[PDB]
């Protein structure tokens, strides 16, 4: 109850800003979890034993991929940390709760392959769960591991509580699902721009929290320039294993997942950057505005990606 955790000062600081790395000592994520936790939510949030147990086995629940790993997870729920904390007052306190373990529980036993390689590959996971298959999967996970004997971090919510947190939890992984982004914000734009957003509409929350739940998962392009260029390496990692497997099922991978096309990567990143990323954090600084950090360093690494087109690196 009177037992903190505490971080070395550099780690103290910089893990206010957006743009912290975590850093490569894997031992110390669960401390900055539990760290992340204690100052946005309070010390009495969540039995730290049970708190402790429960990380252990969404740790143990991913896998050695390039990119959707544990890092990744904890690198989600850091960015989730920095929003709410810069946005104190907006959020419940089940909100609070819920958007950290939603966000370290995002991407559980991702196989390093997208939805679209599970259906061509007509993969089991494709039959149970027919649109947004990996994200439904995670849920699944999420909502197992709370059910292992001494892992229920919510036991001490009302019955209705513990049915809103994990409704919370629900749609903002589900909002992970990228093929859903795109109108997410354009209704959250329209509802914006015509002077119709409420944060008293539950629906209107809910589009609000899964542009936040983008917005952290696209995190990568919000980090300076050495960690987005070095991340960028483990996603394409990722992406041309798939592009492997899909040559091995007879079809020609999109040129993002084909290794051979590796000269078309700045520009596929200019792409990325106009079409995904700068809309996302845009929209997300319009609704939130102390967000603007975000949209900042996502201009920053995108004119980084023009100069290596243009030769300068
Ligand atoms: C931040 O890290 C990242 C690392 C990789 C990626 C992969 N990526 C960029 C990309 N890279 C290439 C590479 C080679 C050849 C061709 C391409 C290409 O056309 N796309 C996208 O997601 N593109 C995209 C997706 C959706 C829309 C709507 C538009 C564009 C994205 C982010
Ligand atoms: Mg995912
Ligand atoms: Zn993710």
Same mark, same amino acid.
């Given at each position: 109850?009177?037992?903190?955790?505490?971080?070395?000062?550099?780690?103290?600081?910089?893990?206010?800003?957006?743009?912290?790395?975590?850093?490569?000592?894997?031992?110390?994520?669960?401390?900055?979890?539990?760290?992340?936790?204690?100052?946005?939510?309070?010390?009495?949030?969540?039995?730290?034993?049970?708190?402790?147990?429960?990380?252990?086995?969404?740790?143990?629940?991913?896998?050695?991929?390039?990119?959707?790993?544990?890092?990744?997870?904890?690198?989600?729920?850091?960015?989730?940390?920095?929003?709410?904390?810069?946005?104190?007052?907006?959020?419940?306190?089940?909100?609070?709760?819920?958007?950290?373990?939603?966000?370290?529980?995002?991407?559980?036993?991702?196989?390093?392959?997208?939805?679209?390689?599970?259906?061509?590959?007509?993969?089991?996971?494709?039959?149970?769960?027919?649109?947004?298959?990996?994200?439904?999967?995670?849920?699944?996970?999420?909502?197992?591991?709370?059910?292992?004997?001494?892992?229920?971090?919510?036991?001490?919510?009302?019955?209705?509580?513990?049915?809103?947190?994990?409704?919370?939890?629900?749609?903002?992984?589900?909002?992970?699902?990228?093929?859903?982004?795109?109108?997410?914000?354009?209704?959250?734009?329209?509802?914006?721009?015509?002077?119709?957003?409420?944060?008293?509409? !539950?629906?209107?929350?809910?589009?609000?929290?899964?542009?936040?739940?983008?917005?952290?998962?696209?995190?990568?392009?919000?980090?300076?320039?050495?960690?987005?260029?070095?991340?960028?390496?483990?996603?394409?990692?990722?992406?041309?294993?798939?592009?492997?497997?899909?040559?091995?099922?007879?079809?020609?991978?999109?040129?993002?997942?084909?290794?051979?096309?590796?000269?078309?990567?700045?520009?596929? !990143?200019?792409?990325?950057?106009?079409?995904?990323?700068?809309?996302?954090?845009?929209?997300?600084?319009?609704?939130?505005?102390?967000?603007?950090?975000?949209?900042?360093?996502?201009?920053?690494?995108?004119?980084?990606?023009?100069?290596?087109?243009?030769?300068?690196?």
């Amino acid at each position: 109850g009177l037992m903190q955790f505490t971080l070395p000062v550099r780690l103290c600081k910089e893990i206010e800003l957006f743009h912290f790395d975590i850093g490569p000592f894997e031992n110390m994520w669960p401390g900055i979890f539990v760290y992340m936790v204690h100052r946005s939510c309070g010390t009495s949030c969540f039995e730290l034993e049970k708190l402790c147990r429960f990380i252990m086995s969404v740790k143990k629940n991913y896998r050695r991929v390039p990119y959707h790993n544990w890092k990744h997870a904890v690198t989600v729920a850091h960015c989730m940390y920095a929003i709410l904390q810069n946005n104190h007052t907006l959020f419940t306190d089940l909100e609070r709760k819920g958007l950290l373990i939603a966000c370290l529980c995002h991407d559980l036993d991702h196989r390093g392959f997208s939805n679209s390689y599970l259906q061509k590959f007509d993969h089991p996971l494709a039959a149970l769960y027919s649109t947004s298959t990996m994200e439904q999967h995670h849920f699944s996970q999420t909502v197992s591991i709370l059910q292992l004997e001494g892992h229920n971090i919510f036991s001490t919510l009302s019955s209705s509580e513990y049915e809103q947190v994990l409704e919370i939890i629900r749609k903002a992984i589900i909002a992970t699902d990228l093929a859903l982004y795109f109108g997410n914000r354009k209704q959250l734009e329209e509802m914006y721009q015509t002077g119709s957003l409420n944060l008293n509409n !539950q629906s209107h929350r809910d589009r609000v929290i899964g542009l936040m739940m983008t917005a952290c998962d696209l995190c990568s392009v919000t980090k300076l320039w050495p960690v987005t260029k070095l991340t960028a390496n483990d996603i394409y990692a990722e992406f041309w294993a798939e592009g492997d497997e899909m040559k091995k099922l007879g079809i020609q991978p999109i040129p993002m997942m084909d290794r051979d096309k590796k000269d078309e990567v700045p520009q596929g !990143q200019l792409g990325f950057y106009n079409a995904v990323a700068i809309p996302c954090y845009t929209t997300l600084t319009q609704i939130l505005p102390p967000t603007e950090p975000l949209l900042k360093a996502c201009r920053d690494n995108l004119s980084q990606w023009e100069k290596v087109i243009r030769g300068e690196e």
